[PDB]
Amino acid sequence: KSKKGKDGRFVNPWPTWKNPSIPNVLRWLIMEKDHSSVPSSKEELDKELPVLKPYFITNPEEAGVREAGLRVTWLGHATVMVEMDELIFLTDPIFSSRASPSQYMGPKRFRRSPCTISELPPIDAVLISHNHYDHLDYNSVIALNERFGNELRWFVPLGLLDWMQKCGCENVIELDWWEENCVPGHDKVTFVFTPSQHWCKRTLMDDNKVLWGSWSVLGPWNRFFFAGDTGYCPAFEEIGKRFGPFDLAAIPIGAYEPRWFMKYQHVDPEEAVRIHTDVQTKKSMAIHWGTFALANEHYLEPPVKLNEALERYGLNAEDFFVLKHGESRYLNND
Amino acid sequence: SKKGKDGRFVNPWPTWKNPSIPNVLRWLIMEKDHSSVPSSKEELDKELPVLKPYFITNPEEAGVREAGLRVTWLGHATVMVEMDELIFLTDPIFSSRASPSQYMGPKRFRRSPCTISELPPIDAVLISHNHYDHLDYNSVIALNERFGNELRWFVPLGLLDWMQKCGCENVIELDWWEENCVPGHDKVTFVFTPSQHWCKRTLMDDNKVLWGSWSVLGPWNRFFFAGDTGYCPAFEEIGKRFGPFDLAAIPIGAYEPRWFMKYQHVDPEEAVRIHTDVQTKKSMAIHWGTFALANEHYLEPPVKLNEALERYGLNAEDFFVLKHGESRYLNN
Numbered sequence: 163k164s165k166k167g168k169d170g171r172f173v174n175p176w177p178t179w180k181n182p183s184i185p186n187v188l189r190w191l192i193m194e195k196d197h198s199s200v201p202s203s204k205e206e207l208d209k210e211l212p213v214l215k216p217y218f219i220t221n222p223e224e225a226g227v228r229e230a231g232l233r234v235t236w237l238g239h240a241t242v243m244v245e246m247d248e249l250i251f252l253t254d255p256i257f258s259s260r261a262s263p264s265q266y267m268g269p270k271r272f273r274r275s276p277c278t279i280s281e282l283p284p285i286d287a288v289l290i291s292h293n294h295y296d297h298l299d300y301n302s303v304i305a306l307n308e309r310f311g312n313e314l315r316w317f318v319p320l321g322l323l324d325w326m327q328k329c330g331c332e333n334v335i336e337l338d339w340w341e342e343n344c345v346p347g348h349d350k351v352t353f354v355f356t357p358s359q360h361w362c363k364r365t366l367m368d369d370n371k372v373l374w375g376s377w378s379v380l381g382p383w384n385r386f387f388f389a390g391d392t393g394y395c396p397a398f399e400e401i402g403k404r405f406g407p408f409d410l411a412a413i414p415i416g417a418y419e420p421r422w423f424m425k426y427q428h429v430d431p432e433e434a435v436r437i438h439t440d441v442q443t444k445k446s447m448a449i450h451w452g453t454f455a456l457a458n459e460h461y462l463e464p465p466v467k468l469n470e471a472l473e474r475y476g477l478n479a480e481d482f483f484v485l486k487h488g489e490s491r492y493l494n495n496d
Numbered sequence: 497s498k499k500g501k502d503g504r505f506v507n508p509w510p511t512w513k514n515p516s517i518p519n520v521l522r523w524l525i526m527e528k529d530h531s532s533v534p535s536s537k538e539e540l541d542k543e544l545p546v547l548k549p550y551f552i553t554n555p556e557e558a559g560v561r562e563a564g565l566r567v568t569w570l571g572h573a574t575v576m577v578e579m580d581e582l583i584f585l586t587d588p589i590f591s592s593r594a595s596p597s598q599y600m601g602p603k604r605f606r607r608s609p610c611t612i613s614e615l616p617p618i619d620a621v622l623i624s625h626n627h628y629d630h631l632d633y634n635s636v637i638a639l640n641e642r643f644g645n646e647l648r649w650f651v652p653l654g655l656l657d658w659m660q661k662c663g664c665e666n667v668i669e670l671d672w673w674e675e676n677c678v679p680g681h682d683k684v685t686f687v688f689t690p691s692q693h694w695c696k697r698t699l700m701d702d703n704k705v706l707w708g709s710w711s712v713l714g715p716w717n718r719f720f721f722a723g724d725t726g727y728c729p730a731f732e733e734i735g736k737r738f739g740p741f742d743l744a745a746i747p748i749g750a751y752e753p754r755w756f757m758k759y760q761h762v763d764p765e766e767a768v769r770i771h772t773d774v775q776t777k778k779s780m781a782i783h784w785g786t787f788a789l790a791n792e793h794y795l796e797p798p799v800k801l802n803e804a805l806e807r808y809g810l811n812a813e814d815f816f817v818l819k820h821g822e823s824r825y826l827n828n
């Protein structure tokens with residue numbers, strides 16, 4: 163084909179090829195995080211947002227997929243564990259309490275992680291959407307690579323290969339817009355890096371030196387889409403048309419407040435439903451939200467707005483569902 | 497009268513104890529090693545199992561409120577003693593890493609048995625010294641957030657600022673041989689007692705704040721918490737002024753290489769020495785098993801403790817090691 167928007171590299175770094183982006187960010191200190199949600203007592207946090215014990219804790223067996231369907235588990239924020247086509251892979255693993263380079267400041271999760279690395283079953287690959295601290299957790303990478311090793315294939319955007327080896331990972335793969343690879347054992351599955359409308363930053367002056375994006379996993383049996391972080395852009399229609407119908411898609415539905423400031427980097431539930439429609443997935447799972455306070459919206463608002471948008475497009479909760487922390491879901495195909 | 501009183505060199509706080517040594521070169525390049533190698537997930541589960549504390553499934557219990565004394569080991573020096581109508585915590589560390597950084601520093605191989613949220617009402621907390629394996633900023637902020645003025649923080653001299661800067665008001669700075677009480681249940685007395693250790697958190701803050709140990713003298717039972725110390729006098733002094741105590745929490749880990757650690761960290765034998773000097777009936781054994789701050793094998797300290805136990809004409813009941821998260825009730 164050819165009608166695919168490629169990068170997307172200005173003078174030296176990467177801009178979003180997409181027209182909706184505007185260049186102006188003033189970073190995370192506490193300015194619009196504050197407490198505009200006031201997550202109250204951890205008990206209320208429980209009552210409203212209970213943390214479940216994942217299945218693989220009480221029954222570490224049954225953690226295959228036995229081909230056929232597709233199993234998914236939400237481990238908070240953008241951490242998703244997908245079992246499909248004889249393969250278990252993790253996405254944006256964050257297990258630390260705080261998503262920050264310091265121990266003294268930064269957004270600290272109000273919901274504990276459902277499980278620990280030691281407790282999670284054998285991981286065959288990890289997918290990294292972009293490099294932000296709420297998706298790339300140094301300590302989580304350290305734990306993953308200590309437990310596993312060369313056993314773990316890491317799929318990262320351009321610019322993160324160095325960082326990965328710097329951490330101590332040897333099975334690391336840098337991928338660009340519309341670029342693919344697989345796991346050495348399982349070649350029938352293809353992992354494709356697909357565009358997105360977001361940004362990268364971890365330190366001073368490294369802004370967009372690393373790429374952002376989304377992931378499309380094409381196995382023979384099931385197809386899976388993982389958006390990562392994005393505001394609405396026309397790449398999602400492109401992806402949907404190139405990788406056919408998907409069985410699951412993980413779409414962010416949180417951190418969309420100060421829309422005047424975030425719309426260029428963060429969809430809201432309404433644009434999240436549109437994404438679900440654009441990518442042609444049969445089902446979608448609400449990621450982001452509920453775990454960290456990265457914006458101004460009420461911590462329970464994003465599911466309500468998701469249901470309101472789902473009623474906007476003539477859809478039901480079946481099509482686009484929100485899980486509990488640690489809850490799983492099985493989906494068999496035709 | 498008597499009692500090894502506090503001291504103050506020209507600049508900092510000294511030990512005033514005859515056993516002494518310098519070169520506190522921190523642990524980043526000097527002995528950064530794990531010649532103990534905790535590994536093999538299965539081996540950890542079996543050798544050092546982490547237990548589910550009672551106040552998780554049955555928080556209502558909250559023990560004591562009677563005459564006896566219950567204790568729970570939450571790793572390293574974070575232990576929860578419920579005694580004489582008072583549930584106090586000591587050296588609380590619940591984070592994974594004991595370091596000012598997020599990228600380097602000693603990271604625990606055993607998770608905390610419970611979390612701050614799961615913790616029962618803590619009336620008081622005791623801080624031995626300022627080291628990262630005993631003073632954990634994140635743990636402090638969590639306690640001061642869940643509780644507040646309801647939490648009395650007993651800290652050594654020099655830590656008032658650090659505490660208030662974190663946001664604590666119910667804070668009491670104490671030099672050793674000094675004391676204080678509780679607003680409601682004041683008949684229990686908390687006394688800061690001597691020790692042989694060091695204080696340092698940053699560059700040039702060496703010995704700017706005091707170290708020591710704690711003695712809780714309640715109406716029914718008496719409890720001793722050593723913290724971190726090498727063998728020195730004043731434990732006999734402690735055992736004299738106060739005592740006999742009922743339970744004592746004595747460190748048994750972080751002792752090798754001896755030549756460098758002996759002056760600043762007891763060994764299991766020296767811990768049995770403490771058990772005799774402080775005149776306790778029983779002892780629980782803290783430090784060890786949670787972080788690797790020295791070169792000894794992670795399972796060695798219990799074995800060496802039991803060796804010292806027999807040699808000194810004692811038995812395992814007298815000085816016991818709990819599991820991670822285990823509790824113990826004492827009706828003496």
Ligand SMILES: C[C@H](CCC(=O)O)[C@H]1CC[C@H]2[C@@H]3CC[C@@H]4C[C@H](O)CC[C@]4(C)[C@H]3C[C@H](O)[C@]12C
Pocket residue numbers: 188189190191366
């Ligand atoms: C507000 C203080 C300094 C106060 C002063 O002296 O005026 C300044 C100085 C250092 C500044 C930080 C430097 C790193 C980051 C640079 C980003 O481009 C904006 C966010 C951060 C996290 C900044 C936030 C804030 O702008 C800080 C913390």
Ligand SMILES: C[C@H](CCC(=O)O)[C@H]1CC[C@H]2[C@@H]3CC[C@@H]4C[C@H](O)CC[C@]4(C)[C@H]3C[C@H](O)[C@]12C
Pocket residue numbers: 263264266596597633697698
């Ligand atoms: C060393 C003290 C902690 C002392 C203590 O806990 O008592 C800590 C507390 C706050 C920490 C600073 C926070 C802001 C900065 C963040 C950067 O990512 C690294 C450099 C800085 C300047 C940090 C340096 C250092 O890590 C500090 C100063």
Ligand SMILES: C[C@H](CCC(=O)O)[C@H]1CC[C@H]2[C@@H]3CC[C@@H]4C[C@H](O)CC[C@]4(C)[C@H]3C[C@H](O)[C@]12C
Pocket residue numbers: none
């Ligand atoms: C921890 C030291 C001071 C310790 C001392 O001298 O006692 C202090 C002094 C300067 C402090 C920084 C000043 C600029 C910023 C002010 C913000 O409001 C909080 C973050 C920053 C980045 C501060 C981080 C940290 O609070 C520092 C590095």
Ligand SMILES: C[C@H](CCC(=O)O)[C@H]1CC[C@H]2[C@@H]3CC[C@@H]4C[C@H](O)CC[C@]4(C)[C@H]3C[C@H](O)[C@]12C
Pocket residue numbers: 300325328329528599600
């Ligand atoms: C210095 C320590 C380890 C030193 C030791 O204890 O032996 C090393 C080990 C891994 C290193 C990190 C690897 C990933 C990152 C690579 C970047 O290009 C710079 C920052 C980071 C976050 C590095 C920071 C630092 O350089 C670390 C944490």
Ligand SMILES: C[C@H](CCC(=O)O)[C@H]1CC[C@H]2[C@@H]3CC[C@@H]4C[C@H](O)CC[C@]4(C)[C@H]3C[C@H](O)[C@]12C
Pocket residue numbers: 365366367368
């Ligand atoms: C000052 C030393 C050494 C100077 C040199 O190597 O020339 C340099 C070397 C590498 C530098 C760090 C590398 C990682 C980060 C790169 C950012 O873009 C700015 C902040 C950080 C955290 C840097 C801060 C600091 O400036 C360091 C530690």
Ligand SMILES: C[C@H](CCC(=O)O)[C@H]1CC[C@H]2[C@@H]3CC[C@@H]4C[C@H](O)CC[C@]4(C)[C@H]3C[C@H](O)[C@]12C
Pocket residue numbers: 521522523524525
């Ligand atoms: C070894 C490197 C520098 C390499 C070189 O020699 O060029 C040096 C630079 C700064 C040094 C650190 C400074 C603070 C501490 C001083 C102590 O007395 C030993 C441990 C610490 C934590 C030191 C460890 C080590 O000695 C470091 C990290």
Ligand SMILES: C[C@H](CCC(=O)O)[C@H]1CC[C@H]2[C@@H]3CC[C@@H]4C[C@H](O)CC[C@]4(C)[C@H]3C[C@H](O)[C@]12C
Pocket residue numbers: none
């Ligand atoms: C992370 C930056 C820069 C990495 C890069 O930009 O390539 C590197 C450059 C200088 C590095 C430091 C040099 C001195 C020390 C060396 C030790 O072995 C580990 C701790 C220290 C304190 C190092 C920590 C960290 O690894 C730093 C700060």
Ligand SMILES: C[C@H](CCC(=O)O)[C@H]1CC[C@H]2[C@@H]3CC[C@@H]4C[C@H](O)CC[C@]4(C)[C@H]3C[C@H](O)[C@]12C
Pocket residue numbers: 263300364365596597599
């Ligand atoms: C800012 C990067 C992390 C970047 C990332 O995660 O990608 C981190 C990685 C290693 C960190 C350094 C480790 C050694 C020092 C610890 C001190 O307590 C604060 C100053 C130093 C020099 C730290 C400064 C800063 O906090 C660094 C350079």
Ligand SMILES: C[C@H](CCC(=O)O)[C@H]1CC[C@H]2[C@@H]3CC[C@@H]4C[C@H](O)CC[C@]4(C)[C@H]3C[C@H](O)[C@]12C
Pocket residue numbers: 192266267633657658659661662
């Ligand atoms: C800079 C942040 C708070 C910034 C904010 O409110 O956003 C403050 C909040 C609590 C502060 C800490 C309180 C305890 C310590 C006080 C010391 O004298 C300097 C180091 C420490 C460890 C402080 C470092 C730093 O100054 C912190 C972490």
Ligand SMILES: C[C@H](CCC(=O)O)[C@H]1CC[C@H]2[C@@H]3CC[C@@H]4C[C@H](O)CC[C@]4(C)[C@H]3C[C@H](O)[C@]12C
Pocket residue numbers: 698699700
């Ligand atoms: C850069 C400022 C200067 C501003 C001032 O005058 O306060 C200085 C002054 C206070 C300094 C801090 C004092 C406490 C610590 C002293 C250590 O030896 C290095 C790390 C710390 C955490 C220091 C970091 C940094 O070196 C600061 C923040």
Ligand SMILES: NS(=O)(=O)c1cc2c(cc1Cl)NCNS2(=O)=O
Pocket residue numbers: 257258259260278301302305590591592593603
């Ligand atoms: N080492 S880690 O990032 O996996 C981790 C971090 C923290 C925990 C637990 C774990 Cl397993 N608990 C307390 N908060 S923390 O220090 O971020």
Ligand SMILES: [Zn+2]
Pocket residue numbers: 292294360391
């Ligand atoms: Zn992001």
Ligand SMILES: [Zn+2]
Pocket residue numbers: 294296297391456
């Ligand atoms: Zn994000």
Ligand SMILES: [Zn+2]
Pocket residue numbers: 625627693724
């Ligand atoms: Zn110590």
Ligand SMILES: [Zn+2]
Pocket residue numbers: 627629630724
């Ligand atoms: Zn210690």
